[PDB]
Amino acid sequence: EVEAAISDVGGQQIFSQALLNANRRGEAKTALAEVQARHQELLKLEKSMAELTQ
Amino acid sequence: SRTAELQAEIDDTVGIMRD
């Protein structure tokens, strides 16, 4: 007559992935992309003070 | 704003010391 055939229900697991804040944007965001123009200024101090020391 | 102030101060000392 009868027996077993399909059984369980209460039993499962799940992993979990993750995205990230957008503002993050490219690494260049404050104190990163400005270092290009901040360097020309610093080269200006170096120079103007080279005039100073000479 | 700090780096600009430093630059201005250095320029002024350069002027004083050319004189």
UniProtKB/Swiss-Prot annotation, chain A:
It comes from the Eukaryota. It is found in: Membrane. Present with 450 molecules/cell in log phase SD medium. Belongs to the syntaxin family. Required for vesicle fusion with the plasma membrane. This is Protein SSO1. It comes from Saccharomyces cerevisiae (strain ATCC 204508 / S288c) (Baker's yeast). The chain holds residues 159 to 212 of 290 of the full protein.
Swiss-Prot record, chain B:
It comes from the Eukaryota. Disulfide bonds: none annotated. It is found in: Endomembrane system. Palmitoylated by SWF1. SNC1 and SNC2 are vesicle-targeting proteins essential for normal secretory traffic between the Golgi and the plasma membrane. They may also be involved in vesicle fusion. Belongs to the synaptobrevin family. This is Synaptobrevin homolog 1. It comes from Saccharomyces cerevisiae (strain ATCC 204508 / S288c) (Baker's yeast). The chain holds residues 27 to 45 of 117 of the full protein.
